[PDB]
């Protein structure tokens, strides 16, 4: 299996009400392992997975100082972008930032990310060659010329191709009992009359990890798109995931339809029929 | 592990 580490940062201004709200979360794959909340009591990077708690105080002290510096830089960013867009000093605005790395099944570097959004719009993004930038409008072009002149991409690449994958591999080993696990979907099919001549078949996948999954409907062996619906994969809240797919079928024809679930935890794709 | 190096927009 391939793997990823992602850090997500949200900074939301609140003029007159103190410094911006800053929330940072860190993920390996679909497992959250750290968070920071500028408004929480601890004022520390906090563990969110069992395998990260084995890191000593040096690790937590250092991540706390870094994440607090992150918050202060993104607080300056809110001020800067306000000027770029000639926006009023009064309103609330949102800076989002994401960075991280993917590795392949050999745990060697696959790709890296470093990108920003302002008020939900793309702002600036490191391109896949990790050497160039996509600026979404004319304020972001200002950032891009500055970052080109400061050779920012070169320093990001040192992290994305190096440090980021080295620590990702550390977490994959230290957390192997949960990060390298696959929980196979528990599956079942429900059925509901929907009109006087139609019924909804719902194919359920429960309790699976990781979140990647494929649920398909077939009629007489042929994949079916007409009258089907996919719900967004959702968290159960215990570290596994849930998802369903439904199709509306003529009543009396339930048995020509099959649901098909593929998931890394399944040695062979499952086939369910009403 | 967080990236330490920070650059302002």
């Amino acid at each position, epitope marked *: 299996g391939s793997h990823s580490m992602r850090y997500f940062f949200t900074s939301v201004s609140r003029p007159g009400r103190g410094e911006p709200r800053f929330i940072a979360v860190g993920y390996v794959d679909d497992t959250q392992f750290v968070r920071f909340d500028s408004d929480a009591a601890s004022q520390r990077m906090e563990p969110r997975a069992p395998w990260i708690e084995q890191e000593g105080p*040096e*690790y937590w002290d*250092g991540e706390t*100082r*870094k994440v607090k*510096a*992150h918050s*202060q*830089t993104h607080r*300056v960013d809110l001020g800067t972008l306000r000027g770029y867009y000639n926006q009023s000093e009064a309103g609330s605005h949102t800076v989002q930032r994401m960075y991280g790395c993917d590795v392949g099944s050999d745990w060697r570097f696959l790709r890296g990310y470093h990108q920003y959004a302002y008020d939900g719009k793309d702002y600036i993004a490191l391109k896949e060659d990790l050497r160039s930038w996509t600026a979404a409008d004319m304020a972001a072009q200002t950032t891009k010329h500055k970052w080109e002149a*400061a050779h920012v991409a*070169e*320093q990001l*690449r*040192a*992290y994305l*191709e*190096g*440090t980021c994958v*080295e620590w990702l591999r550390r977490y994959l080993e230290n957390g192997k009992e949960t990060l390298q696990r696959t929980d196979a979907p528990k599956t079942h099919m429900t059925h509901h009359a929907v009109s006087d001549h139609e019924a909804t078949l719902r194919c359920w996948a429960l309790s699976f990890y990781p979140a990647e999954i494929t649920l398909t409907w077939q009629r007489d062996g042929e994949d079916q798109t007409q009258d089907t619906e996919l719900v967004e994969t959702r968290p159960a809240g215990d570290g596994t995931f849930q998802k369903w797919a439904a199709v509306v079928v003529p009543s009396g024809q339930e048995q020509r339809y099959t649901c098909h679930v593929q998931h890394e935890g399944l040695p062979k794709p499952l086939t369910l029929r009403w | *592990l967080l*990236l*330490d*190096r*920070l*650059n*302002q927009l």
Partner: T-cell receptor
Amino acid sequence: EVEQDPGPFNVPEGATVAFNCTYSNSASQSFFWYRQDCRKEPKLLMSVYSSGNEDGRFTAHVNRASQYISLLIRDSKLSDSATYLCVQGAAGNKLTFGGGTRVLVKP
Amino acid sequence: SGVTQTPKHLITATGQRVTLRCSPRSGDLSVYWYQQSLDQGLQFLIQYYNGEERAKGNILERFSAQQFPDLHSELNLSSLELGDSALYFCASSVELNSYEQYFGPGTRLTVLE
């Protein structure tokens, strides 16, 4: 957290000299070499953010596994005689300086 | 202009006070004070950004600093001791959180009995 070899390294003119500096915190990921002439201010020589960096007759290399930083100076000139400071960045905002390595290039 | 500092040299007696002045690089909003001594090398004292104290090293109570609206900085040392003899370096950077710190030429302070 930054320990380097004080020297003085006596280098025949035109020879190659290299010295190490070690860092304690494995999470550290940004380092630099600075040059400082006697009683003057420290000046950036070269940054090292990844496994290594080569800038001209100078070559620096971060052994992230070994947790040490190296500098190498090829074809040493008398003008290279100086103190070389091993420098670690922390948290994105703080520089920590080693005590310095003195090199004396002999004519 | 680059980073400038005044005076270049100060000779004073124990118990006195002095003021060190720094004008950062034009365009720089951060100013940092560093102390270089024979016994502990180069040590970070304090950083201002746009007039506000922002990061603190192991600066003593009897040391105090300031960045003014024109972004120049003043480092005041009081109840001077022999041990305060050192090279005091101003540095500046464009941004709040930066490793790209450009050092001034230093003020040398000697405190004699």
